[PDB]
């Protein structure tokens, strides 16, 4: 089997992408944030505290003839941005782009943190990291991909995120028309539960490539590119007037600037992030200070190849017995 679904930016900055997901019988379609940095499929629901729902579409398990309470199971998750959610668990039929999994754990939120409530466009998350990170207790549950894997034509999914435009998540096949050149594959460590890999270096604009190992994670659920402070300083030094602002929370730059590209290495291959992809717009409405799309990871503990980096590539998440990542230009 295969599946293919379009993923759509939630706003004009590409802050996140939403993908329609069919849950239950008859289908209830929710727009979920596909997140290769986490491993829970959770949804706003009829059980979510009413004051914490503000415009989201909810899953109502009592209206699904295939929903079953997973007795005794609870979940609770906290994300790298400080947001969180928790609740109970149903199993139900879940379909993405024509690919159907029966008995998928659907984690129904009883509580969500304010950042979720305040974003009416995201109805929940669909985790695509390794199932070892799934938070369901006392019986850990599998991700949608883990459940589908054995049925897929090939045990892979691909992320093809658009810049200021829709893109595609495919399951079970590589669309050889969706990229240019060849796909370069690189080793993955699953020891932290992530799609963790080592970039071979970077360049700023037309500058020389610096060969240096940068361990980080491929994370579709993170907006920005978070890299070591040395790398980030080298980038922003090429933008007149850019500076790190403790009060804003990162590097800002004059909105009048033209940003240089940023290249990262995948083995001997190179992925070029155009400068425009690094502009996240005014820090507040009407400001002439703009927020940068490359930020320091120093306070995180891990480097994160988020959407800024991934949307410059066609990315293969190869879930074979020994997982690997592939990157191609497009």
Curated annotation (Swiss-Prot):
KW DNA-binding (keyword) present: no
Residues the record marks as active site: 35, 199
A single GO BP: proteolysis
Primary enzyme class: hydrolase
MF terms in GO: aspartic-type endopeptidase activity
Domain Peptidase A1 as annotated: residue spans: 17-328
Assigned EC number: 3.4.23.22
Keywords: Aspartyl protease, Disulfide bond, Hydrolase, Protease, Signal, Zymogen
Disulfide pattern: 255-290
Reaction it catalyzes: Hydrolysis of proteins with specificity similar to that of pepsin A, prefers hydrophobic residues at P1 and P1', but does not cleave 14-Ala-|-Leu-15 in the B chain of insulin or Z-Glu-Tyr. Clots milk
Assigned protein family: Belongs to the peptidase A1 family.
Name listed for the protein in its UniProt record: Endothiapepsin
Natural source organism: Cryphonectria parasitica (Chestnut blight fungus)
From-to range in the entire protein, with total length: 90 to 419 of 419
């Amino acid at each position: 089997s295969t599946g293919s679904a379009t993923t759509t930016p939630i706003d004009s900055l590409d802050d996140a992408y939403i993908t329609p997901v069919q849950i239950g019988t008859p289908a209830q379609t929710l727009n979920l944030d596909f997140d290769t940095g986490s491993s829970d499929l959770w949804v706003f629901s009829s059980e979510t505290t009413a004051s914490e729902v503000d415009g989201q579409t909810i899953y109502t398990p009592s209206k699904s003839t295939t929903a079953k309470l997973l007795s005794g199971a609870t979940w609770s998750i906290s994300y790298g941005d400080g947001s969180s959610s928790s609740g109970d668990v149903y199993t139900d039929t879940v379909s993405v782009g024509g690919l159907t999994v029966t008995g998928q754990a659907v984690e129904s939120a009883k509580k969500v943190s304010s950042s979720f409530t305040e974003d009416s466009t995201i109805d929940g998350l669909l985790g695509l990291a390794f199932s070892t990170l799934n938070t369901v207790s006392p019986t850990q549950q599998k991700t949608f991909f883990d459940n589908a894997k054995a049925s897929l034509d090939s045990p892979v999914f691909t992320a093809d995120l658009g810049y200021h435009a829709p893109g595609t998540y495919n399951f079970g096949f590589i669309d050889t028309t969706a990229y240019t050149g060849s796909i370069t594959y690189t080793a993955v460590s699953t020891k932290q539960g992530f799609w963790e890999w080592t970039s071979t270096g970077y360049a700023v604009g037309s500058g020389t490539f610096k060969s240096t190992s940068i361990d980080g994670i491929a994370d579709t659920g993170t907006t920005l590119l978070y890299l070591p402070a040395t790398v980030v300083s080298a980038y922003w030094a090429q933008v007149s007037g850019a500076k790190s602002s403790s009060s804003v929370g990162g590097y800002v730059f004059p909105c009048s600037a033209t940003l240089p590209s940023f290249t990262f290495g995948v083995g001997s291959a190179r992925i070029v992030i155009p400068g425009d992809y690094i502009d996240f717009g005014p820090i507040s409405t009407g400001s002439s200070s703009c927020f940068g799309g490359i930020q320091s990871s120093a306070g995180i503990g891990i480097n994160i190849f988020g959407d800024v980096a991934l949307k410059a590539a066609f990315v293969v998440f190869n879930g074979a017995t020994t997982p690997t990542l592939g990157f191609a230009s497009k």
